[PDB]
Amino acid sequence: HYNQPNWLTEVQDTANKALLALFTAEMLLKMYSLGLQAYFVSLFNRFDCFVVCGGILETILVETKIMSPLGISVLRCVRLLRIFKITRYWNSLSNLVASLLNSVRSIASLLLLLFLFIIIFSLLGMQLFGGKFNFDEMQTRRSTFDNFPQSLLTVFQILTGEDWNSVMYDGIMAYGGPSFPGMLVCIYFIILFI
Amino acid sequence: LRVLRVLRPLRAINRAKGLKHVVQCVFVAIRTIGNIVIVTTLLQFMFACIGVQLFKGKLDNVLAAMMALFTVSTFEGWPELLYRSIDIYNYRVEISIFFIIYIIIIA
Amino acid sequence: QVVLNSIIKAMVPLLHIALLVLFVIIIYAIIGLELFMGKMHKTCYNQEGIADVPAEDDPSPCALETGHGRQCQNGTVCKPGWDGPKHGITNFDNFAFAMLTVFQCITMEGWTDVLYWVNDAVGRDWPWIYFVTLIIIGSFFVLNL
Amino acid sequence: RISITFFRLFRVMRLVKLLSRGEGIRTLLWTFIKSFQALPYVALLIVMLFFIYAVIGMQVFGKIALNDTTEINRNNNFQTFPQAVLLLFRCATGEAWQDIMLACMPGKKCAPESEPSNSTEGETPCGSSFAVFYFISFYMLCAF
Amino acid sequence: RVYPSKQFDVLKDDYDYVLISSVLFGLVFATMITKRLAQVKLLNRAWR
Amino acid sequence: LKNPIRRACISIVEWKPFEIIILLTIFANCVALAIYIPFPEDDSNATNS
Numbered sequence: 001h002y003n004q005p006n007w008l009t010e011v012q013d014t015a016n017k018a019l020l021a022l023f024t025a026e027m028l029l030k031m032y033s034l035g036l037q038a039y040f041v042s043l044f045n046r047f048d049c050f051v052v053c054g055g056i057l058e059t060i061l062v063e064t065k066i067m068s069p070l071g072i073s074v075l076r077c078v079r080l081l082r083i084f085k086i087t088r089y090w091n092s093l094s095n096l097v098a099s100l101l102n103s104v105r106s107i108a109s110l111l112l113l114l115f116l117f118i119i120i121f122s123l124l125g126m127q128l129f130g131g132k133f134n135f136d137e138m139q140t141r142r143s144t145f146d147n148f149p150q151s152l153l154t155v156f157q158i159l160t161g162e163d164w165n166s167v168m169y170d171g172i173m174a175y176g177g178p179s180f181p182g183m184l185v186c187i188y189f190i191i192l193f194i
Numbered sequence: 195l196r197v198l199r200v201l202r203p204l205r206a207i208n209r210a211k212g213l214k215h216v217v218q219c220v221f222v223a224i225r226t227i228g229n230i231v232i233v234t235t236l237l238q239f240m241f242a243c244i245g246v247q248l249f250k251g252k253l254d255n256v257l258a259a260m261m262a263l264f265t266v267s268t269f270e271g272w273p274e275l276l277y278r279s280i281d282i283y284n285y286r287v288e289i290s291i292f293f294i295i296y297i298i299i300i301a
Numbered sequence: 302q303v304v305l306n307s308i309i310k311a312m313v314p315l316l317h318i319a320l321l322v323l324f325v326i327i328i329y330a331i332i333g334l335e336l337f338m339g340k341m342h343k344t345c346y347n348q349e350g351i352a353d354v355p356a357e358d359d360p361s362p363c364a365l366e367t368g369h370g371r372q373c374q375n376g377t378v379c380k381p382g383w384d385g386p387k388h389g390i391t392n393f394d395n396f397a398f399a400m401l402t403v404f405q406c407i408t409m410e411g412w413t414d415v416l417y418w419v420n421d422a423v424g425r426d427w428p429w430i431y432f433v434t435l436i437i438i439g440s441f442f443v444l445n446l
Numbered sequence: 447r448i449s450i451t452f453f454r455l456f457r458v459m460r461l462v463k464l465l466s467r468g469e470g471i472r473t474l475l476w477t478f479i480k481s482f483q484a485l486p487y488v489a490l491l492i493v494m495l496f497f498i499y500a501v502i503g504m505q506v507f508g509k510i511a512l513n514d515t516t517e518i519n520r521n522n523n524f525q526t527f528p529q530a531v532l533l534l535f536r537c538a539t540g541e542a543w544q545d546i547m548l549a550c551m552p553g554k555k556c557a558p559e560s561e562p563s564n565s566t567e568g569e570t571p572c573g574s575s576f577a578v579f580y581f582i583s584f585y586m587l588c589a590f
Numbered sequence: 591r592v593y594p595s596k597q598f599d600v601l602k603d604d605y606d607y608v609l610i611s612s613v614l615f616g617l618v619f620a621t622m623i624t625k626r627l628a629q630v631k632l633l634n635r636a637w638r
Numbered sequence: 639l640k641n642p643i644r645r646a647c648i649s650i651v652e653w654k655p656f657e658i659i660i661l662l663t664i665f666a667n668c669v670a671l672a673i674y675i676p677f678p679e680d681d682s683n684a685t686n687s
Contacts, residue, residue: 002256073244130676162273210487331458417521630650
């Protein structure tokens with residue numbers, strides 16, 4: 001519960017190792033009661049075998065010294081994966097997670113296309129302004145087009161539609177003051193939204 | 195508790211019958227919705243415990259601070275969080291991306 | 302290539318729908334030109350080129366019928382100027398600027414700001430119907446799309 | 447002649463006649479505006495939701511303490527019914543309603559004009575620290 | 591500072607990196623093209 | 639319309655590694671345009687050169 005005691009934390013340690021036994025007795029049984037090549041190939045229990053082997057190896061490793069351990073974190077994460085057994089029952093969540101796993105293969109192309117699109121638009125924005133956000137002012141503007149990462153995050157923020165109007169006003173006022181030829185910048189924003 | 199005399203529309207709107215079943219289905223799936231909320235809250239508790247035990251060391255709660263931030267981070271305010279934080283400073287910024295992933299998970 | 306082809310092909314039959322928005326984005330804009338032609342010219346420059354506000358309040362005109370823009374700062378001057386938009390951009394004059402303003406309003410972002418500005422400039426309760434109709438038409442068009 | 451210059455709007459109304467020339471698309475309109483068959487039921491539900499969530503705020507958010515440049519002003523007035531409807535509609539669309547939620551705090555003074563409002567005990571007689579959940583529920587219901 | 595023997599120890603300051611990269615890339619491209627042409631010629635000669 | 643040798647012997651260069659090298663060239667161009675340190679007006683610091 002986020003506390004940092006010492007009298008009970010030690011008690012919290014040894015029991016964890018015992019849990020490994022509680023997470024192993026079935027394993028060998030499934031290697032004994034069921035076939036060697038039958039149980040091992042299901043695409044679900046094989047993940048469980050990998051999880052338990054990684055957990056016991058991590059416990060053995062954290063029994064000794066290790067820099068940036070993360071062993072407790074991953075052990076607790078694989079304890080969350082124990083609820084995946086609870087997910088095996090009441091398949092109303094197993095079907096959802098299976099659909100989520102399936103959808104990534106299709107969505108990869110769309111996310112790649114979106115990333116390329118934001119890349120090209122960020123490059124165009126960097127070319128158009130290139131640090132011309134002087135504004136004849138001193139206050140630190142929340143966005144600028146001088147470096148690649150800041151330009152990329154500015155383009156992302158404009159795409160999200162958050163405070164993009166002020167950014168467009170600043171961009172047009174940088175060079176193209178309100179006039180007949182000063183609106184050429186403005187349309188660049190509009191398309192970038194739609 | 196002053197002018198509660200508006201029960202007429204409840205009786206009057208009982209003719210279409212095309213939405214009472216909708217209400218019944220919503221209030222029978224609200225249990226699954228709450229269970230999903232609970233498991234997501236448990237995931238948030240896990241991630242927050244990891245993060246605050248490993249980082250965010252002081253020089254709200256492991257299962258409520260993220261919810262309190264979400265009360266202003268409903269996809270309208272998390273960009274405000276980035277806007278304010280663009281100025282510790284870079285110490286565990288991944289929580290923001292976590293505030294992505296969790297929201298993405300919700301999303 | 303196949304994904305991009307499918308994306309570009311999907312939007313073609315809906316292209317006609319997009320055309321409708323153009324009409325809308327003109328029609329209501331024209332209404333503003335009838336009702337908000339140079340309504341932001343009058344300002345409240347305190348002494349000389351500086352408004353009697355903390356650079357945030359709209360210097361609404363000292364109208365003959367008081368109630369809006371009372372500018373009771375213990376000594377005020379109401380003169381024509383540009384104290385509307387932060388850069389004099391979204392003023393309803395310069396019809397392209399009116400089109401930009403109506404487009405910024407139709408995206409459901411900050412329309413309350415210009416609503417409050419115009420209400421303070423001309424008066425209360427008169428013009429909100431226009432913005433309400435614009436927003437409901439935008440919602441209906443989003444549903445159609 | 448303001449408020450009577452609809453005839454010029456009639457000219458822009460002639461632009462609507464262009465939509466007629468899009469007969470092939472006006473059928474879409476003939477299937478939307480004439481779709482008002484199941485629409486009245488949900489419309490009545492949403493307007494009665496607005497009624498029940500509007501009349502309930504009047505007594506619990508009375509004396510809204512309109513003040514200049516403090517996110518609660520004459521434009522942000524609430525005690526008047528049409529302006530309260532305007533404010534709840536603005537909150538419904540999600541236009542920065544977090545500020546509206548943050549504008550009603552238990553420690554915020556609300557129109558210190560009543561006789562038992564002399565701040566003798568240092569208490570602001572304005573709780574209003576329940577509108578967060580109520581407005582969240584309103585947003586969820588309207589979205590649904 | 592003086593170098594009696596024309597500074598045989600340090601690389602010259604007028605080294606053209608771009609030309610080296612260009613010639614390397616051209617050599618690789620020519621290798622690939624010639625390999626393809628030779629393979630196609632052998633295949634076509636086999637089938638008369 | 640001419641296919642004695644050259645047209646026949648040039649349509650054969652459609653290798654997969656050919657397209658791979660073209661994509662690598664495109665990626666290199668994208669990376670080259672990525673940094674392109676901006677300057678106010680014609681600052682030749684041996685990088686843009």
